[PDB]
């Protein structure tokens, strides 16, 4: 029951905000002590490569960005309740990692 | 009251010609403690007219490749120069600066109308802003150039240049170039 | 005999003066809201050089603060803003005491109960919100509340059955009961969206005005039409004189002061002597407030100026 934390990590913002909000309101209605979403610095993966395969042109470059948005929600609740509240909330395009102490 | 480097007053300074009276800023409402303002005075047209003339001097001082963004050093060059000026002549340096810019500004320039290779120029009038621009540019190039490879420093070279320029001495680079530009306008007409 | 004269013009706010609020307790203190997201408290020095001086400015209401009102004691203040939240201010120090966070869209009007224990607030939500003192939402009415926006909501100050009045942009002036929240009257006279509804100082007459520019008088005791007062342009504000027994509305560039036994033109307030900005449209009068003693009128204009109109008796 002690200090389970839940790390929600995704590339989409909307889906991550929706699922995390659902976990929070799902926990709040049960009268459980919850520490709110801790938004960490957004990880931006940059790749800059030549457009051309051959290498004859005006030396143009692509700029490929990949965004990683990470949220932490913390609970002071029993593991039995934590298991089912973590079980019910599934979404394609979010990764959830639960840790205790 | 407000005094330049907290030791030079801006009330005892006096403008000669009415033409430049609204194109040399140094006066009651433009009185600043340091040249260094970091304003947006080159944002649009006729905004640099409201730039303090001391700031225009120290900005046009950091010109050549090695000193492009080395303002903090031009401010102390101008500070030392102003002290040298006061020691040599006796009176307010800001008056000497204004006198130098008043004298140094070319009144009639020559414009290119024709083809390239051949020289054919029409003599035309110079705007009060362009007079101030060329005056500052000529003073700095004279200072710079004069002290490039010899022992006297930039500070006392700038002082010497402004002493000569203010009292219209033939030795000043700025006076020689003005004289030549007006003589070329006189040659065309 | 009794004509209005411009005594001075307080200049503080930097935007449209949306609402002015006064109290009988403090006669040297008025509280005016504006479109610079600021509510300024005035010290009425009544000097020759200027009538008032900016004293304290409440800040933090993000978007335009539309309505402002203060309690019976000169200690609290309530406001409703376009950010969609109400703020209850501590007037002494000038800090927010409580935040009501319920509405969705822009809050247009708020009202303070006579006993100072109940709050009613109208928005663009198509709903009225009943808040209590501590600040939790009590009752959100959605039983055909309004088809369009709710422009003005007010209380009826009397010892009789306490009732609230609510006009909207659906042409309806609707009357609710607190603790019951059912309709007694839905009045249908106007032809145009409504801006203001004001109750009498006694608490017997209701005055509704808007785009139509024809102020219509009802009676709360029966629920029937009495008069149709024919105004000029759009009515921005109605207010009853607490002593003189007059009705003062707001035409766009002028303020009309009228008698209720004569039904005649008593006065016309227009301040335009210079013709420098005569090519442009005149500056609109938005807010109307009365002084403590009911001898003076406070007019809020869209040119960022609050004017005082002193009744010069002979």
């Amino acid at each position: 029951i002690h200090r389970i934390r839940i790390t929600l990590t995704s590339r989409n913002v909307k889906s991550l905000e929706k699922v995390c909000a659902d976990l929070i309101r799902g926990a709040k209605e049960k009268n459980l002590k919850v520490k709110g979403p801790v938004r960490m610095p957004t990880k931006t993966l940059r790749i800059t490569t030549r457009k051309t395969p051959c290498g004859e042109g005006s030396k143009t470059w692509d700029r490929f960005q990949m965004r990683i948005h990470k949220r932490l929600i913390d609970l002071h609740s029993p593991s039995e309740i934590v298991k089912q509240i973590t079980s019910i909330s599934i979404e394609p395009g979010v990764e959830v990692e639960v840790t205790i102490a | 009251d407000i005094k330049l480097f907290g030791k030079w007053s801006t009330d005892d300074v006096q403008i000669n010609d009415i033409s430049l009276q609204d194109y040399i800023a140094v006066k009651e409402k433009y009185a600043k403690y340091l040249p260094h303002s970091a304003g947006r005075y080159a944002a649009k047209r006729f905004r640099k007219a409201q730039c303090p003339i001391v700031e225009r001097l120290t900005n046009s001082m950091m010109m050549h490749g090695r000193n492009n963004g080395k303002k903090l050093m031009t401010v102390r060059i101008v500070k030392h120069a102003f002290e040298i000026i006061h020691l040599l002549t006796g009176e307010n340096p800001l008056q000497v600066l204004v006198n130098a810019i008043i004298n140094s500004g070319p009144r009639e320039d020559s414009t290119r109308i024709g083809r390239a290779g051949t020289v054919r120029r029409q003599a035309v009038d110079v705007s009060p802003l362009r007079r101030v621009n060329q005056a500052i540019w000529l003073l700095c190039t004279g200072a710079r150039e004069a002290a490039f490879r010899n022992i006297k420093t930039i500070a006392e070279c700038l002082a010497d240049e402004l002493i000569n320029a203010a009292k219209g001495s033939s030795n000043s680079y700025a006076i020689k170039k003005k004289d030549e530009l007006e003589r070329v306008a006189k040659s065309n007409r | 005999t009794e004509q209005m004269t411009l005594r001075g013009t307080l200049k503080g706010h930097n935007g449209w003066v949306t609402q002015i609020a006064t109290t009988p307790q403090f006669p040297d203190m008025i509280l005016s809201a504006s479109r610079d997201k600021t509510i300024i408290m005035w010290k009425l020095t009544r000097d020759e050089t200027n009538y008032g001086i900016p004293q304290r400015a409440l800040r933090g209401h993000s978007h335009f603060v539309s309505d402002v009102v203060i309690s019976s004691d000169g200690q609290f203040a309530l406001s409703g803003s376009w950010d969609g939240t109400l703020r209850l201010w501590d007037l002494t120090t000038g800090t927010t005491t409580r935040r009501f966070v319920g509405h969705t869209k822009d809050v247009l009007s708020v009202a303070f109960s006579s006993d100072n224990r109940q709050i009613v607030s109208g928005s663009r939500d198509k709903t009225i919100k009943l808040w209590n003192t501590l600040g939790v939402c009590k009752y959100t009415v959605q039983d055909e509340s309004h088809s369009e926006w709710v422009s003005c909501v007010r209380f009826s100050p009397n010892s009789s059955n306490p009732i609230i009045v609510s006009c909207g942009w659906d042409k309806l002036v609707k009357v609710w009961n607190l603790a019951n929240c059912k309709l007694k009257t839905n009045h249908i006279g106007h032809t145009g969206y409504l801006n203001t509804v004001t109750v009498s100082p006694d608490g017997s007459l209701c005055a509704s005005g808007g785009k139509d520019g024809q102020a219509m008088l009802w009676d709360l005791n029966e629920g029937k039409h009495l008069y149709t007062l024919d105004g000029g342009d759009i009515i921005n504000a109605l207010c009853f004189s607490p002593n003189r027994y007059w009705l003062c509305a707001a035409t766009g560039p002028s303020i009309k002061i009228w008698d209720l036994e004569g039904k005649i033109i008593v006065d016309e307030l227009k301040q335009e002597v210079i013709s420098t900005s005569s090519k442009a449209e005149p500056p609109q009068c938005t807010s109307l407030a009365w002084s403590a003693d009911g001898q003076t009128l406070f007019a809020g204009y869209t040119d960022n100026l609050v004017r005082v109109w002193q009744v010069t008796i002979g």
Partner: protein, 66 residues
Amino acid sequence: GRVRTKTVKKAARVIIEKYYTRLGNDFHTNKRVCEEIAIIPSKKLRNKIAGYVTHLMKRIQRGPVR
């Protein structure tokens, strides 16, 4: 320079001749009613329409717009 495109013009016009009685002279009221009136794609587009609606509502009193 900045010229209002056929999109904001067309939209603004049909808004006037549908909800003339709803609109007035103030930009912010027209901006707020334009949200409720039309399903509009973005804030900028709504601001530009609200602005040109304001501009038309000025000159409608001056004379009859074609």
